[PDB]
């Protein structure tokens, strides 16, 4: 009878993945802001990006209500941290220019 | 890189043919094999018969697929004489820049 | 004795390359800023982005402490240049109203 059957052709090859999305100096804001929330600013990644936070990604939570409430962080590509130096051009939280 | 026509002379190896599968330094090419009944005597193919039809023997390299798509951002945009949104200009600024 | 070892099945193929990283219209600082640095920027992007800046990329460079100090150019695929027409919400630089 017909041997095993085997493949004799060649073969498609699988997909891949190529170099990673870069992020930018962004400043997005969340109704009734106390603090920093990294609830909040996961669900804003994962509704636009469609991909997790990459590193060194930075992104600016405020009250939109207090303008001066403002918080910042950088993902450092496991989790939000305190960046080292960041300063942005609404830095001016407590209307005071020195 | 694409199937070679069939072969129509009767040498073995037939001209721009090898006898043993050549290495395949460049992936994108594929090894070609077509065969025939041999005459050991003449070292030729039999007469009456000739070369099969030219069918790829080696892998196939596979194309190239899609990965993650792009993540957007919380921008801002100015446009000279903006007397409302535009779906145009903002479709412009997309295609010229993502 | 055995021939040669060829290769019979198939071959998977390589990575490709997809659609390009889209750029926004970002806004950063730089502690110090007496004008436009490529270099700065070039860092900026090389550390978060994890590439190289694409077509029709717009970065704004500003100094936070005196937020009139603003620099905006036009990343055109080879170099930092200035753009045609950008204008920002923060464009108002000598505190003047007209």
Chains 1, 3 share one sequence.
Not at chain 2, 26 to 32: F, R
């Amino acid at each position: 009878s017909w041997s095993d059957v085997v493949q004799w052709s060649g073969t498609e090859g699988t997909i891949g993945h190529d170099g990673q999305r870069g992020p930018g100096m962004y400043s997005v804001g969340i109704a009734g802001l106390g603090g920093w929330d990294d609830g909040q600013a996961n669900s804003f990644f994962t509704s636009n990006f469609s991909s997790a936070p990459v590193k060194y990604d930075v992104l600016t939570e405020y009250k939109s209500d207090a303008p001066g409430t403002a918080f910042t962080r950088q993902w450092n590509g496991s989790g939000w941290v305190n960046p080292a130096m960041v300063l942005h051009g609404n830095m001016i939280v407590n209307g005071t220019i020195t | 890189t694409s199937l070679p026509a069939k072969p129509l002379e009767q040498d073995y190896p037939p001209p721009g043919w090898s006898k043993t599968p050549p290495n395949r330094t460049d992936m994108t090419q594929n090894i070609y094999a077509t065969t025939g009944t041999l005459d050991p005597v003449t070292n030729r193919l039999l007469e009456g018969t000739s070369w099969s039809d030219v069918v790829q023997w080696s892998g196939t390299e596979g194309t190239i697929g899609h990965d993650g798509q792009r993540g957007p951002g919380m921008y801002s945009v100015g446009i000279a004489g903006l007397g409302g949104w535009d779906d145009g200009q903002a479709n412009s600024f997309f295609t010229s820049n993502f």
